[PDB]
């Protein structure tokens, strides 16, 4: 576990901060001296995150499928802490259906919340970062956005779109002092994926053994948070437009 | 590929037209689908050899279903699909509007998916088939201005992988073609917003590619010569991303 | 199966043309109207390939670990057919050992034959191609050169080096009219890999079932030859410095 | 990382020196290995805090074995390894000689492998460890002139994957760092053969990177914060390959 003094007094917005990776990201950032706006679709969970964290952190409710609500989030961060230095777009949904059974309604929702949402956070965060002299962004994608996982079509399509979001953000805002990188976790112990791992094949492992074989073990959300906080830090001054693979080796070999 | 039935979306102009003509030269029955019915008819007419024309708005699932059915009615079934329908949009990430984002995704990514969603069951009925989704180098490397476009093209790259994955056991293959700079009306309009176009092309890619050059790759990807190629991202960029030029 | 009239009367050198992918490449090229020099470490196998093929094709012996022998190969192709338009570097060895047990002697041999060999073929082929107004090259690598396969360290290191060979060849010779691309087959029915698949784990599939799960089925060498001949053709005019994955989907998903 | 033991090859100058100093700031015992013994001593002396110096020619397996043993003797064992030793060579693909190719491979690729070969058993004896192999953007994207160099750097990228694969169950992680343009003597000499250096750097990467900036990534990759990062190729190129610049 490493420290970053460049993060003391910085302001960060974390979306999906109510549970899992986002709650883990919010708490780690607070411990680095950040002012954190914990945003979530579930208003109570957001309040509860800020309550767990302390460190003067604040909460707000955001449905990242609505642009106006994203604008109101950034406004609230500015009004609570004076500006915006860091962004972690982590809000998202998982959806499971074969590619040929997925409905348009489901696809639209998954693209709106995941892809359109991550973009809109960058669209309204970045202007405020430019005023501060630069900033850092991490969008959470998934291994399913670069490698196929059966049943994750819509989801995977949205998560691929996020991987490219970071590149185009890096390209367009590097001369404004802004960095953007994508984090690709594989299998993490969080409520969001617990819905997903209900997927049980004709074999009794297949989640438990699937995950052990591919990744070695289940990942703790805390292990993704240390990566996110590194990527937001000045130790990552030379890292922009990259896909950070944090999959415990999953795609490094034939397992 | 003689005797095979192919649907090509955006067949009215550009790569789609070169792809349709080229599949026709290979003995293939071709349904030319386009949002412009006159371009569709004009293409089918230009090609001549059995090709049918069809008007499709790939933002509308119902019309995509009708297009596949039209191809079954005209030709018996469906063996090959080339999803080339698309739109370009230019605007910075921060100046892009929700409406333009939604429309670019709807047409490019959703449309490409829906085309596979409904063509694939017909390929299953035939014992298998092959899909080539047309994306862009801009779906993998950021070109400034091309946010919503690029994001949608990136998602198509992933469409092909998930398709290949779930449908391999049904004998269906899917790959993405990533052209860079090709002489087409869709692009020429785009590129006309000018390290500017002319010299970038010469330097990265060597010269502008013809739509025909792309067509011969599509056809290769659709053929039994590509029988062990599936879920891949095919780069036809003249070296652009291979080197620091 | 598709045709290419642009290949009639073209001259191709195929190394490792005695068996497997190379024999398959040589025979397909002959059927496209190519003059083929079938080169192999095993002189008899080379003669026998040219004998199977007919079509005026010729044979020569080459140990691609020796530069002089590579020079003599190109000389013989020039003397037999007048020049050199196409190259397929396919000569190679497989070696199996854990990364920590591999000897220097074994590493050196595997790098010399695979990596140094493919390079040297390009070094002495390319000048002759430049005289003809351009040309095409395919180097055979392996999925093991981009993804880890346990026991293939040296081999995999050499095969990665080949993937980059193509990029640097494309870069340096594009303005001379020369294209270079790498083919990455996974699991093919050839004698070269049959040594490899003797690798049997604590489970009875593990080759048979390993290969079915990952790739769907065993690949026929003929299926790699159609890809090589495409890549050498003018239908690939816009393809240079790429890694052609012909793995039947192996790395497209979590299998 | 306090209390951990690290071997850094090529610690005498450049990224290696920044890596050694930076691990020292983190409470880590460091063996500074370099082909130049004076640079090794000078580095260990500059750092001061327990660091030992060691002369190594990574083309020679026997000296690599002695280096690991020296680190065990000095500090008890080995937890971390940073293989940064290397040489640059410039020559076109067709003008490169077998001798220069052999030497570049020997030092860069073989040397990096041998360092892992012998350090890893010591990491196993400790319950695990972490490796960072230093490669180059030139190992993935072709820079003209850099053939043998690039080929060797590409192989290192694969070293890290096979290492991660076979050694994950022993608690060992391995990753590659791919810097682009960093202000170091090794590079400055290289880059001095001048779309030329100054402007390419500004355009692709934004500015030249400091060796320190690279060091902080190495340290991150060696830390328990990177506990779910293994077999990866870490890109620290300031955006170079993310966009068409």
Q: SS3 sequence, B164-179?
A: HHHHHHHCEEEEEEEE
Question: Tokens 């790498």 label which residue?
Answer: C182
Burial of A101: CB neighbours in 10 Å, binned 0-12, 13-18, 19+:
exposed
Q: How far apart are CA C219 and CA B166, in angstroms?
A: 20
Identify the H or E element spanning C135: strand C135-140
Query: How many Å lie between the alpha carbon of D76 and the closest alpha carbon of chain A?
Result: 23
Q: Phi/psi at B132 (nearest 5 deg)?
A: -125, 115
Longest dimension (CA), chain A: 55
Q: Which residues contact D217 (CB under 8 A, 6 or more apart)?
A: A235, A236, A238, A239, D177, D234, D236
Superfamily of domain A1-255: NAD(P)-binding Rossmann-like Domain (3.40.50.720)
Answer yes or no: are the C-beta atoms of B172 and B123 closer than 8 Å. Answer: yes
What is the maximum span of chain D, computed from C-alpha positions, in angstroms? 50
Cβ distance of D166 and C150 shorter than 8 Å: yes
Size of chain A, expressed as the number of residues it contains: 255
Method underlying the structure:
X-ray
Cα–Cα distance, A246 to A149 (Å, whole number): 17
Q: How far is D83 from D68, CA to CA, in rounded Å?
A: 12
D32 strand-pairing partners? D8, D53
Does residue C252 sit in helix, strand or coil? coil
Pick the catalytic residue: A155, A182, A232, A240?
A155
The three-state secondary structure class of C131 is: helix
Give chain C's radius of gyration (CA, Å).
17
Integer Cα distance of B107 and B99 in angstroms:
12
Domain regions of chain C by residue span:
1-255
**Cβ burial C109-120 (10 Å sphere, 16+ → b, else e):** bbbbbbbbbbbb
Distance in angstroms (rounded) separating the CA atoms of residues A146 and A148: 7
- Whether the CB-CB separation of C85 and C129 falls below 8 Å is answered with yes
- Residue D2's φ and ψ, nearest 5 degrees, are -65, 130
Angle between helices B37-47 and B15-25 (to 10 degrees): 30
In angstroms, the CA A51 to CA A58 distance is: 8
How many whole angstroms separate alpha carbon A123 and alpha carbon C70?
58
Pick the residue of A212, A218, A238, A253 with the most D CBs within 10 A to test the interface with D by mutation.
A238
Angle, helix A117-132 to helix A67-81, in steps of 10 degrees = 30
Phi, psi of D93, deg, nearest 5: -55, -45
Task: Look up tokens 């043309």; give the residue.
Answer: C17
| Residue C228 CB contacts under 8 Å (≥ 6 apart), including other chains | C21, C25, C28, C88, C138, C140, C183
Determine the Cα–Cα distance for residues B167 and B176; give it in Å rounded to an integer: 15
Pair C111, C158: CB distance under 8 Å: yes
> How deeply is C97 buried, as exposed, middle or buried, from its count of CB atoms within 10 A (0-12, 13-18, 19+)?
middle
**In sequence order, what are the beta bridge partners of B31?**
B7, B52
Contact C154, C215 (CB under 8 A): no
CA-based Rg of chain A, rounded to a whole angstrom? 17
User: Of the candidates D84, D89, D26, D20, which has an alpha carbon nearest to the alpha carbon of residue D52?
Assistant: D20
Residues of chain B neighbouring A149 (CB-CB closer than 8 A) = 162, 165
Contact C2 B225 (CB under 8 A): yes
H or E segment to which residue B22 belongs: helix B15-25
Give φ, ψ of A130 to 5 degrees.
-60, -40
Q: Measured between beta carbons, which residues in chain A are less than 8 angstroms from residue D228?
A: 185, 219, 223-224, 227, 246-248
Phi, psi values for residue D227, rounded to 5°: -65, -25
The three state secondary structure string of A186-217 is: CCECCHHHHHHCCCCCCCCCCHHHHHHHHHCC
Cα–Cα distance between C223 and C28 in angstroms, integer?
10
The residue whose two tokens read 């400034």 is: B144
Q: Is B149 a catalytic residue?
A: yes
3-state secondary structure chain D: CCCCEEEEECCCCCHHHHHHHHHHHCCCEEEEEECCHHHHHHHHHHHCCCCEEEECCCCCHHHHHHHHHHHHHHHCCCCEEEECCCCCCCECCCCCCHHHHHHHHHHHHHHHHHHHHHHHHHHHHCCCEEEEEECCHHHCCECCCEHHHHHHHHHHHHHHHHHHHHHHHHCEEEEEEEECCECCHHHHHHHCCCCCHHHHHHHHHCCCECHHHHHHHHHHHHCHHHCCCCCCEEEECCCHHHECC
d(CA D50, CA D31): 9
Strand partners, A181: A138
Instruction: Give yes or no for a contact between C75 and C96, defined as CB atoms under 8 angstroms apart.
Output: no
Q: Do B30 and B51 form a contact (C-beta atoms < 8 A)?
A: yes
Per-residue tokens: A241:
């437009």
Residue in chain D nearest A244 by alpha carbon: D234
- Classify each residue of C132-143 as buried b or exposed e, where b means 16 or more C-beta atoms within 10 Å of its C-beta: eeebbbbbbbbb
Give residues after which chain B gaps, C-N over 2.5 angstroms. Answer: 194
Tell me which chain B residue has its CA closest to the CA of residue D195.
B245
Distance CA D163, CA D148 (A): 23
Distance in angstroms (rounded) separating the CA atoms of residues B96 and A116? 11
* Cα C181 to Cα A164, B88, D213, distances in angstroms: 26, 30, 35
Q: Report the distance separating Cα A27 and Cα D31, nearest Å.
A: 36
Q: Is A176 left (phi over 0), alpha (psi -120 to 50) or beta?
A: alpha
Q: How long a stretch of residues is chain B? A: 245
Positive or negative, the CA dihedral B236, B237, B242, C3 is positive
D1-245 folds as Rossmann fold (3.40.50)
E strands within chain B?
Answer: 5-9, 29-34, 52-55, 80-83, 129-134, 172-179, 233-236
Q: Positive or negative, the Cα torsion across B2, B3, B5, B9?
A: positive
CA-atom Rg of chain D in angstroms:
17
Tokens standing for residue D178: 């791919």
Q: Do D155 and C160 touch (CB under 8 A)?
A: yes
b/e burial code for range A12-49 (CB count within 10 A of at least 16 → b): bbbbbbbbbbbbbbbbbbbebebbbbbbbbeeebbbbb
DSSP, collapsed to helix, strand or coil, labels residue A125 as helix
Q: Are A99 and B162 in contact (CB under 8 A)?
A: yes
Cβ atoms of residues A25 and A52 within 8 Å: no
CB atoms within 10 A of CB C50: 23
C-alpha closest to that of B21 among B53, B58, B47, B51: B47
Alpha-carbon dihedral angle through residues B147, B153, B158, B163, given to the nearest 10 degrees: 150
- Bridge partner residues of A244 (DSSP): A183
**CA–CA separation, B46 and B40 (whole Å):** 10
Element at A60 (helix H, strand E): strand A58-61
Of the candidates C253, C248, C251, C232, the one whose C-alpha atom is nearest the C-alpha of residue C28 is C232
Q: What is the DSSP letter of B146?
A: B
Candidates D164, D174, D181, D180; CA nearest to D133 is D174
User: Which chains form contacts with chain D, at 3 or more CB pairs under 8 Å?
Assistant: A, B, C
Distance CA D156, CA D98 (A): 20
Q: Is B200 close to D244, i.e. CB distance below 8 A?
A: yes
- What is the distance in angstroms between the Cα of A118 and the nearest Cα belonging to chain D? 18
Q: Which residue of the set C89, C155, C179, C227 is catalytic?
A: C155
Annotate D175-194 with b (16+ C-beta within 10 A) or e (fewer): bbbbbbbbbbebbeebbeee
How far is Cα C40 from Cα A249, in angstroms, rounded to an integer? 38
In angstroms, the CA D143 to CA D129 distance is 33
Locate the chain B residue with the closest alpha carbon to C235.
B216
Contact A232, A12 (CB under 8 A): yes
Degrees to nearest 5, angle at CA D218 with C102 and A3: 140
Q: What is the token pair recorded at C159?
A: 């095969």
Provide DSSP, A142-161.
-GGGTSB-TTBHHHHHHHHH
**Residue B103 neighbours by CB under 8 Å, 6+ apart:** B59, B87, B89
Q: How far apart are CA B201 and CA B192, in angstroms?
A: 13
First to last CA, chain A: 29
Q: Identify the contact set of chain A against chain B, taking CB-CB distances under 8 A.
A: 67, 98-100, 102, 104, 107-108, 111, 115-116, 119-120, 122-123, 126-127, 145-150, 152-153, 156-165, 167-173, 241
Residues belonging to chain D with any Cβ–Cβ distance to chain C shorter than 8 Å: 61, 92-94, 96, 98, 101-102, 105, 109-110, 113-114, 116-117, 120-121, 139-144, 146-147, 150-155, 157-159, 161-167, 231
CB pairs under 8 A between B and C: 100
Query: Rounded to whole angstroms, how far apart are CA atoms A43 and D54?
Result: 59
d(CA A228, CA B201): 37
Q: How many CB atoms lie within 10 A of CB A132?
A: 15
Distance from C-alpha of D161 to C-alpha of C251, rounded to nearest angstrom: 15
Cα–Cα dist B131/D180, whole Å:
37
Give the C-alpha separation, B130 to D239, whole Å.
36
Which H or E run contains A119?
helix A117-132
Question: Residue C182 region, left (φ>0) first, then alpha (ψ -120 to 50), else beta?
Answer: beta
Chain B residue with CA closest to A158: the answer is B155
Task: Report how far apart, in Å, the C-alpha atoms of B6 and of each of B13, B20, B66 are.
Answer: 17, 9, 15
The closest CB to that of D117, out of C99, C146, C172, belongs to C99
Q: How far is CA A124 from CA A118, A159, A240, D113, in A?
A: 10, 20, 19, 47
Residue in the structure block whose two tokens are 């309550």? A51
Sign of the alpha-carbon dihedral angle for B92, B95, B101, B107: negative
Two tokens, residue D202: 């500004």
């Amino acid at each position: 576990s490493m420290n970053h003094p460049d993060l003391a007094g910085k302001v960060a917005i974390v979306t999906g901060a109510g549970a899992g990776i986002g709650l883990a990201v919010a708490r780690r950032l607070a411990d680095e001296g950040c002012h954190v706006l914990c945003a979530d679709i579930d208003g109570d969970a957001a309040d509860a995150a800020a309550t767990k964290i302390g460190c003067g952190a604040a909460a707000c409710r955001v449905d990242v499928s609505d642009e106006q609500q994203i604008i109101a989030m950034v406004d609230a961060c500015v009004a609570a802490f004076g500006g915006v230095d860091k962004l972690v777009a982590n809000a998202g949904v998982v959806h499971l259906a074969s590619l040929i059974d997925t409905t348009v309604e489901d696809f639209d929702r998954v693209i709106a919340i995941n892809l359109r949402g991550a973009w809109l956070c960058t669209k309204h965060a970045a202007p405020r970062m430019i005023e501060r002299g630069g900033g850092a962004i991490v969008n959470l994608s998934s291994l399913a956005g670069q490698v196929a996982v059966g049943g994750t079509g819509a989801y995977g399509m949205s998560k691929a779109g996020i991987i490219q979001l970071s590149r185009i953000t890096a390209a367009e805002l590097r001369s404004s002092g802004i960095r953007s990188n994508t984090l690709l976790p594989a299998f993490v112990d969080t409520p969001m994926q617990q819905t997903a791992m209900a997927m049980f094949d004709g074999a009794l492992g297949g989640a438990r053994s699937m995950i052990a074989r591919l990744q070695g073990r289940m990942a703790a959300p805390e292990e993704m948070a240390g990566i996110v906080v590194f990527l937001l830090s000045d130790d990552a001054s030379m890292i922009t437009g990259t896909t950070q693979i944090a999959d415990g080796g999953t795609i490094a070999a034939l397992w």
